[PDB]
Amino acid sequence: KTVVVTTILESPYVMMKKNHEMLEGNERYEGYCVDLAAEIAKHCGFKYKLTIVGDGKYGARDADTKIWNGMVGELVYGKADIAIAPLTITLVREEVIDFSKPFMSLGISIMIKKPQKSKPLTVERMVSPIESAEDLSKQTEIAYGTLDSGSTKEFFRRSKIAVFDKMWTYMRSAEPSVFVRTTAEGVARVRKSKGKYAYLLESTMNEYIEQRKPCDTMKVGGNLDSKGYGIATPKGSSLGTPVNLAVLKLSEQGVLDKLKNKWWYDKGEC
Amino acid sequence: KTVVVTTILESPYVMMKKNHEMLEGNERYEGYCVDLAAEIAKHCGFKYKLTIVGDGKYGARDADTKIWNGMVGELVYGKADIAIAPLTITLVREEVIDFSKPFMSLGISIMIKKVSPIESAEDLSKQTEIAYGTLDSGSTKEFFRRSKIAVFDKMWTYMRSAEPSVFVRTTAEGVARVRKSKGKYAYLLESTMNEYIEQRKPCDTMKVGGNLDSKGYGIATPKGSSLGTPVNLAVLKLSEQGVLDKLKNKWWYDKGECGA
Amino acid sequence: KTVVVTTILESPYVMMKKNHEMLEGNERYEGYCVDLAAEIAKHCGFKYKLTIVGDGKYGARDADTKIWNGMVGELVYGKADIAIAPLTITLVREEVIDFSKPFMSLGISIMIKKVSPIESAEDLSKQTEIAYGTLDSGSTKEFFRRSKIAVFDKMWTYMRSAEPSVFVRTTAEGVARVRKSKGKYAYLLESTMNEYIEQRKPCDTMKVGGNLDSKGYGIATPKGSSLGTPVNLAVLKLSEQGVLDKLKNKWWYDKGECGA
Amino acid sequence: KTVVVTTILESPYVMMKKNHEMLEGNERYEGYCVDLAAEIAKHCGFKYKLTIVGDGKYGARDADTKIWNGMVGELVYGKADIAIAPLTITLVREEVIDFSKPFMSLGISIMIKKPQKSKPLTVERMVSPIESAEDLSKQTEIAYGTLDSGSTKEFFRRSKIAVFDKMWTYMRSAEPSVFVRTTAEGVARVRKSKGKYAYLLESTMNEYIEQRKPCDTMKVGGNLDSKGYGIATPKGSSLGTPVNLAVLKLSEQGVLDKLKNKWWYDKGEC
Ligand SMILES: NS(=O)(=O)c1cc2c(cc1Cl)N[C@H]([C@H]1C[C@H]3C=C[C@@H]1C3)NS2(=O)=O
Ligand SMILES: NS(=O)(=O)c1cc2c(cc1Cl)N[C@H]([C@H]1C[C@H]3C=C[C@@H]1C3)NS2(=O)=O
Ligand SMILES: NS(=O)(=O)c1cc2c(cc1Cl)N[C@H]([C@H]1C[C@H]3C=C[C@@H]1C3)NS2(=O)=O
Ligand SMILES: NS(=O)(=O)c1cc2c(cc1Cl)N[C@H]([C@H]1C[C@H]3C=C[C@@H]1C3)NS2(=O)=O
Ligand SMILES: N[C@@H](CCC(=O)O)C(=O)O
Ligand SMILES: N[C@@H](CCC(=O)O)C(=O)O
Ligand SMILES: N[C@@H](CCC(=O)O)C(=O)O
Ligand SMILES: N[C@@H](CCC(=O)O)C(=O)O
Known part of the structure; x- marks a missing residue:
């Protein structure tokens, strides 16, 4: 049974390829999260189909309704089996889905x-x-x-x-x-x-x-606080421990550092 | 039921008090990990007693008889209920013991x-x-x-x-x-x-230079223990309330016996 | 028996003479490769006629019908006996044609x-x-x-x-x-x-920048031809006598229409 | 039939290991030529045992007797099957042994x-x-x-x-x-x-x-002339073409320059 890997459309995690109109399947996208999903599939053998949420939201809980939306919402109610996306590990989210160990630090x-350069010896300052x-x-x-x-x-x-x-x-x-x-x-x-x-x-x-x-x-300034990105999974699913061990294995093997370096600094300019 | 807490003597995580010879119980210890244990116990509501691992080792395997030693071996063999200490989260340890979300980044x-x-x-x-x-x-x-x-x-x-x-x-x-x-x-x-x-x-x-890699410290517990979810939730709540940063600033930069 | 020599029109390897319209035969060509061919013919003792490959390509395969084109294709299909030209020694070409020792380094x-x-x-x-x-x-x-x-x-x-x-x-x-x-x-x-x-x-x-890799130019001949050993020996003798360096200096730095 | 890979004792080509006393076989040596022989074995499957020539000479022909010695000599008279070593491709050598394409340029x-640094403002010149x-x-x-x-x-x-x-x-x-x-x-x-x-x-x-x-x-100064190092082989042997193809494959694959960099500039002590 092929499981669907929901994701958001945010650079550089998931992009749209230049020649994507004729392409179809999991080959339409590129970026960091697609490489993460590929390595997760390599670690534990399973078939995955990349997906983008309908509302394009990360996930929140509406007041007076208590209905989750976004990636978290669509993962909770069962239309997806995993969320390989830049999803932030949150206390409120932890009580409804399962988060793996963080694969990237953030704040x-x-x-x-x-601001523009300041002319007033002839040195420039920001x-x-x-x-x-x-x-x-x-x-x-x-x-x-x-x-x-x-x-x-x-x-x-x-x-x-x-x-x-x-x-x-x-x-x-x-x-x-x-x-x-x-x-x-x-x-x-x-x-x-x-x-x-x-x-x-x-x-x-x-x-x-x-x-x-x-x-x-x-x-x-600096980071206001410290958080991390984790791979979400519905509560009581067979994929939790395998993806957690896969994340740890990729972190130890240096795959995460190489992917971050090649997707953040290698393709930069100016 | 008193919860046995294992930890290592590491500065500034766990250190002996200046006049520890007079006090007894958990009052003879101080440090970042002691405050973290106090906050976790407040969140969960259990009585805990601090203990020091007999051998000054974090965790390793004998590699010939597959015997764990240190805090990890303390947790595996039922001699401890939780390991609040600078225990790095690793692939080998995760297979034998249960870790929580990281409470501090490192490398x-x-x-x-x-x-x-x-x-x-x-x-x-x-x-x-x-x-x-x-x-x-x-x-x-x-x-x-x-x-x-x-x-x-x-x-x-x-x-x-x-x-x-x-x-x-x-x-x-x-x-x-x-x-x-x-x-x-x-x-x-x-x-x-x-x-x-x-x-x-x-x-x-x-x-x-720079950090060779990026890891974290996790609060460990025996695999399948009932404390793992409460301590994970406590760590998340403490991180979101900003008290982990407060403790790190208190035990790392608030003293600062150097000119920087 | 006249030996047909194939080569490409490349400066300063093979170039048309200033008044090449008046002359005929091998006297209408000049360059490093022409002098190299003259030295090889002197060493071996054969009469050679210079020819230019019909298509201005060195050597490649169609990748769909396994057809060779260029000087390599000229040598494979019996249309030429030797290829004295800036032909790089490669794994794909070496499997189909015979190369000699390199006479010039490059990258x-x-x-x-x-x-x-x-x-x-x-x-x-x-x-x-x-x-x-x-x-x-x-x-x-x-x-x-x-x-x-x-x-x-x-x-x-x-x-x-x-x-x-x-x-x-x-x-x-x-x-x-x-x-x-x-x-x-x-x-x-x-x-x-x-x-x-x-x-x-x-x-x-x-x-x-620096060279991406290091390669060499080889004097090519059909696989199994009787000329491979004599041309290899001629290349070695020319290298040891120092005349290859003389030719390179003559056609590269002796003229030198630049200020360096 | 295991063939013998003869080599000279020169640095950084073949060097005895620090703990070479208790070790035996092909593990007594380290350097560039050992890696080259290992890659040659990997390309074309065959068993080899490293050896060092008795006289410790590269190879030359004398007068009167006209008997070759050194690596070239002991390769011509049949007591060796291949010479993976810093052997220079020479015209006189080519008439008695088979030389592959050069795997390293030299001069x-x-x-x-x-010389000592010169005192003469307070700049140093060599x-x-x-x-x-x-x-x-x-x-x-x-x-x-x-x-x-x-x-x-x-x-x-x-x-x-x-x-x-x-x-x-x-x-x-x-x-x-x-x-x-x-x-x-x-x-x-x-x-x-x-x-x-x-x-x-x-x-x-x-x-x-x-x-x-x-x-x-x-x-x-600079190089007086330009030469190369080739893998020697007895005349008419069944190993010249495979080792030549292996040399070309290694050169194109980027193994040769990688080995040269790791054995020449990776241990600069000054
Ligand atoms: N340098 S980085 O942001 O790409 C980055 C960040 C992190 C990595 C790995 C990398 Cl490469 N692994 C750690 C994991 C390893 C073990 C300790 C903490 C988690 C479990 N999480 S992390 O500290 O969020
Ligand atoms: N600034 S710090 O090193 O004391 C620090 C480091 C970290 C903190 C909190 C603090 Cl205060 N929380 C995160 C946790 C919070 C949620 C997101 C990642 C884990 C689960 N881990 S962390 O990125 O290792
Ligand atoms: N200086 S140069 O580029 O004109 C040049 C380059 C080379 C020369 C001779 C010259 Cl003059 N000979 C060598 C050959 C001689 C013997 C050793 C390696 C090959 C066989 N090839 S080379 O290293 O490619
Ligand atoms: N940079 S180096 O001296 O280690 C070096 C030198 C040489 C290399 C490869 C390397 Cl890495 N391959 C060439 C070979 C490739 C093809 C062209 C000439 C021979 C056959 N010989 S070389 O020009 O002697
Ligand atoms: N990454 C965040 C959304 C981005 C943001 O809030 O800045 C999340 O998963 O909720
Ligand atoms: N704190 C580390 C050990 C310290 C180190 O290896 O530098 C651990 O939990 O294993
Ligand atoms: N001289 C090269 C081609 C030139 C080039 O590709 O730059 C050859 O023989 O194929
Ligand atoms: N490498 C040379 C010997 C070293 C030298 O003459 O400097 C040879 O094979 O003959």
Whole structure:
């Protein structure tokens, strides 16, 4: 019985190949998550069919309804058997699905439009108007937002830290809304809002966007917290321990480091 | 029912108190792992007693009679209920004991005494002028043993067939050997321990190059035990509340007996 | 019996004379390969007539009907007795035709128009800003096709699936394309040809980085022919007498229409 | 029928292992030629046992008796089946044995004791008393020699170039003799003659010795000529074509340059 491997469409994890209109099957995609799924199949022998969720969401729980959506939602209710995607290991998610050991480390970062060079011996320096989340929350001219139905949104929603509490209170009562429906939408908003918008996304995607043309964006400060990407699996499934052992084996063998290096730094420019 | 907690005497994870001869019970111990155990017990609601593994070894197999020794062998043979300590999550251990989600990231680093002709691990392996060894009966020696990369294979082949014994018993012995070898010996050890050592008196060592790989410390328990899910949930909740970062800052940088 | 010698029109190996219309026979050709053929004929004692291969290709297989084309195809199908030309010694060719000892060393190089953001081949492969291609129906495209290294596999995958046609018919076309693309196209070709081109007017190109590999030019003959041992001995004697170096200096650096 | 793979004892081609006393067989040696023989065995399946020639010579033909000696000699008279070693492809050698395609390029170079650094703002410069072979032949204070019963000695013996002819004329009538019996002997004489001796040897050995401690020797000028190392084989044997094909396959596969890099520059002690 072939199981379906759900995934999100987020660079560089899963892409669309240049010659993909004529291609079909698991050969339409490329990136980090496709290599991860290939190595998982190599470790434990099974047939897998790549899939993209209908709503293109990572997964959240709607209030007053308690119906999960996105990748997590479609994995819980049984239309998929695994989720090999950049899914963040979360406490609320852990109670509904099974997460393997993290295969990549990450953190919440801040992305802003890259400031221009300062002429005033004839040396150049970078002057960023934001250097940390605290001063980001202190000011009120730069608007900041996150990805809707994501993990950062829930992290800010259920946070007791003072700075994150102020950031969440500002976010939930902003007109117009500061939340974006896609990472690409947030990056485009950052690039196009004349340096007046800051996007809070994961550090891996932040670095990937920073290393690609036209590279007019940069990351300020450090990670707000530390998390990891895990391979999700429905509760009480036969695939949990095998994929966990496969992740550990790939980490020991250096496959994960090689894939990260070849998908993040080898193909960069500028 | 009192839960027996096994752990190793490692700084700043578990250390003896200044006047520990007077206190008794769990009040004679201090450190990052003690606070982590206290938070876990608060989350779960059990009475725990701290114990130190009889042999100062984390975990290894005899390789001839398939006998585990150390904290892992303490857990496998029913002598302990949980191992809250800097126990690295590895493929060999995961098959015998149950691990939780990582509570701290780490890696293999290089520590030398205070022009840096070594940079990364490649130059250290290529240059035979300076000696290098790891801790025995640990996750570093077992990592270099099974490594299939040319640089780490060369390093392991040198280390195993090296005279005299390039391995040390405890990481304190490795630190003392590095401080005493006068730039001739390099120590390979966990990154977090390297930072803690380099940020302490008399600040005669530094961490050179980058991390060789990325691993984590997991809170271990016997396979199939009823505590694994509660401790995993406790670790996740502690990570999300930001108290793990608070504990790391408290035990790593809040003291900081160095100028950096 | 007159020996038919096949060769390609390549500078400075075989070139048409300035007033070749007036002369006839072998007197209308000049170059390194012409002098090499003259020396070989002197050593062996045979009357030879120079011919140019009908199709301006060195040697390749159709890959679908197993048909050889070029100088190798000329030798295989009995149309020629010897191939004194810059024919690279390769595994595929050696199985079908007989080669002699190399008479000149070479390698795969990179040629760009006159800060060098490319250096070696690794940065050329990683950086997709600048395009790069080789000569079709030659030993360079066949080298990149069969290469099992990651960098060369990536380069080949880019080159084959490249729009428009990144391959050129003759190396003169590739040189003109490099001079015309204005720093956007890089050419991969033999090292000796690269030096000869870069040491010629108007000196608008240079050879960047090191050689990708090391190969040689061999004097080819049909498999089992009676000429293989005498031509191999002639090549060895010419190498030991130092006249091959003399010919290379005469046709490469003696003229030297550049300031270096 | 197991064939014998004869080899000379030279570095970094074939070197005795540090713990070579208790070991026996083909495990007593390490270096470049052992890896080359292993790859040759892998390409074409056959069993081989490494051996060292009795006289420790590369091979030359004498007068009167006209009896070949060394590796070439003991390969011609049938007590060896193949010579995987740094054997130079020579015209006189080719008429008695079969030579494969060269697996490594080389040339005759000059090795001298490294001069002391010059005091003269406070920059250091290296000055050498010899910069070419012509300048080496012009002077008389610095003696120079080669290896007895080698390819370089025969190259100088039959040379017709004026500089090489005069160098040979000086060599044949020098008291005491300037020739050495081993490459290590020549290097020791260079290091002990306090700058009054120059050794002419192959470029590969010259670079290898230059890259090893105490690194008090240097190479001056450039290669006098161009030659190559080939795998020898008795005339008319059934092994010439397979070893030639193996050499070509190894060269195209990138094994040869990988071995050269790992045995020449991977252990630079200076
Ligand atoms: N350098 S990285 O982000 O690509 C990366 C990150 C990680 C890797 C491996 C790599 Cl290559 N493995 C670890 C795993 C190994 C064992 C210890 C923690 C988990 C189980 N998780 S991780 O710390 O999230
Ligand atoms: N900053 S740190 O090294 O003290 C650190 C490191 C880590 C933390 C939390 C902290 Cl504070 N949590 C993560 C865990 C949280 C969830 C996602 C990955 C594991 C499960 N592991 S981690 O990436 O190893
Ligand atoms: N200096 S050069 O490129 O013109 C050059 C290059 C070479 C020459 C001779 C010259 Cl002059 N001879 C050798 C040959 C001689 C004997 C040893 C190797 C082959 C057989 N091949 S080579 O190493 O390819
Ligand atoms: N760079 S090197 O000296 O180790 C080296 C030198 C040579 C190599 C391969 C290497 Cl790696 N192969 C060539 C061979 C390939 C084909 C062309 C000439 C012979 C047959 N001989 S070579 O030009 O003598
Ligand atoms: N990776 C996150 C979504 C991205 C974000 O929230 O920034 C998740 O799995 O929920
Ligand atoms: N802390 C490691 C051992 C330390 C080391 O090997 O450097 C473990 O749990 O095995
Ligand atoms: N001279 C080469 C072709 C030139 C090239 O491919 O660069 C040959 O004999 O095939
Ligand atoms: N390699 C040479 C000997 C070394 C030398 O003459 O320098 C040979 O095979 O004859």
